[PDB]
Symmetry: C3
Subunit: 258 residues, 3 copies
Amino acid sequence: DLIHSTAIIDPSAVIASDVQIGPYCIIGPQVTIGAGTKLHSHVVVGGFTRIGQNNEIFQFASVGEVCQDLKYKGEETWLEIGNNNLIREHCSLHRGTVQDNALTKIGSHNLLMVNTHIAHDCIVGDHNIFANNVGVAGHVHIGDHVIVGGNSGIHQFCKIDSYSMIGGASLILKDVPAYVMASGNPAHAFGINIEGMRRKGWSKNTIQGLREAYKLIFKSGLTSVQAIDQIKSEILPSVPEAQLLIDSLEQSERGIVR
Amino acid sequence: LYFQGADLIHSTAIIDPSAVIASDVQIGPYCIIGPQVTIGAGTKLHSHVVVGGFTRIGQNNEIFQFASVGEVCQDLKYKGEETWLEIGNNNLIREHCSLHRGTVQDNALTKIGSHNLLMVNTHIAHDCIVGDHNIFANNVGVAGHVHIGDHVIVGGNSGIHQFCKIDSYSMIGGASLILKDVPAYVMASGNPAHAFGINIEGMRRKGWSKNTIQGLREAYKLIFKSGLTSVQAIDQIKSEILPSVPEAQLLIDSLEQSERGIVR
Amino acid sequence: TENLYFQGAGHDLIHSTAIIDPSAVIASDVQIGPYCIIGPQVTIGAGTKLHSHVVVGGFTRIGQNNEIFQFASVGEVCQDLKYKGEETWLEIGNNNLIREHCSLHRGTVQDNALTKIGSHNLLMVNTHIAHDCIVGDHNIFANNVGVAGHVHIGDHVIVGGNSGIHQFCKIDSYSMIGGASLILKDVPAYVMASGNPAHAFGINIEGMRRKGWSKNTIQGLREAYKLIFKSGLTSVQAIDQIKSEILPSVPEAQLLIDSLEQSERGIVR
């Protein structure tokens, strides 16, 4: 009785032996669910979805449904979810498009609060928190240890790098570099995520170097190239953590928040 | 002798005996179809769709899981009256949307046309009238008695105040709050929203003539950038633009039909 | 009995497909629609109606004459990462309207292990009430309102659609929060707050008149507002000038004093 008799499971589904599936769930074709995962009642896994281990998915979540992209033409595309994620009521996680790489991917140890939307072709890393009503549009790439405040929306193709923090009710139109606190509509940069650094017990020398690099990037009238060069020469040798900020600038395709 | 000649309606769907469902309609597991519902040919309901009652759904629609379609409205004045929701053809209604029936205080009718996309968690309140070829992005809230035209786009997490008229080819930016009427062709954005010109880019990509586009830009300037009253702007558009750019009539309509005033 | 042209296509108060924990305590006339799930330690009072597809997770007390619509998740474990499976509760009073896709979460032991909602509230589609909120009576939450943890809401509050309220904020009685707002600080009684983030825009005059309040009462509240927000005065001095010049003739001004005294995040300005 781990799988409720009222769950409707496509004959193609592959479900690990200790998986719990609650009443009235629907599991579509080509779905795999790994060990220790628990679905509550009333979960829909649309199709073509790989779910890892020890996940927990709550009622009224729509997981692995076809994307909202109007270019979509029925092509085979996928959603992947890693391990130890919490996916709350009324989330919507959509599959990829052929125009990108036919894949939406979420990593491990993520919290997706009520009504989190992960659009087609997002790539999301580990240990992220998406608060209530957060919308992540198509092709957005999110790193690790990011917090996205409630009722925020992220423009398609943005890159949201590790340890960043997005304030409640933000409209993110540009890339958010590593460690950066970005907030508002439209969102701008507000400093380094200091509290998050000290909450992970980060050193005085690290935080100070990252504060200096922030200043060089956002407040010193320097171009991206000039800022990177000054970080490399003055900060990176003793603060290797500064590399994540260099990466953000070098990988930015929409420009960065200001 | 008695063969079907065609699985389509899942056996777990609970369908009111008064419901009329076209023979090729697909209805997924655990759907609820209330009384006085009609569903047209080629329509597909996924699992877990609730159609509350008194709802007419047209042809070739697709309604996704956890949509609440044709439920009683949230107006505290509503007292259980048997009002209606009408949906046209070829609409895509995504997960968690909510479309509510009308009130007797207006015309007992919420109506949406055809070829619309309602993205995840689109809310259409009682007494809304929505046209064709519109796009509502995620988490859009359209309040009571709002009238939306054709070819409109409403960006994510936006809300539209009761009674506003959002005319054809307009665009509402993401994370916006619309408090007044948005005229035809107008880009409105912000909280509270202001007007930011004509959607030139759309028009160009759509192959509208350079003359049409220039005429609408000029009409916009008269309405928004010239210090003219509504009536003075209208009269100048009629005399100088309307003769070569009949498309400018939609802007005249917007100003003449406005009841809340226009977003500026 | 028609033996010729009958349709022959067919009710119980509780649908056969509802799955109800045996520990549930359900009043005689309660209606529960198809496919509902009622978890352990749930009580539901007389006159209450659940539509189809309602989940009541557990450890929830629901009063009389409530109406809960499809896809509502009621009394589910909260989203606080601090929560570790402890016994915590949700209480709902009477005559509430809980619309589609609402989510109401139980408390945490870090507070008082209880989320509480009163009576005669309207929670429109996708209203989220986080762990440990306390909500009073006659409130209206418009579509897509997200109320974060430990928020205290009084009575007769209106929260506009697509708004958010930050954890620990106190939203006092008769206040009004505009559409698309983000509340970061406490909102005093009778105050109109609007914006992302929200700021104060005077007394909720229209709301008062709508409850039949006198012009003398209204003018007094406006004077008190002027003292708190516009008279270059400190919190303490404003309270004193209200106590000596307004509170005599306008006893309703006490709510505003309460707001200032009980504020822990500071007030919206």
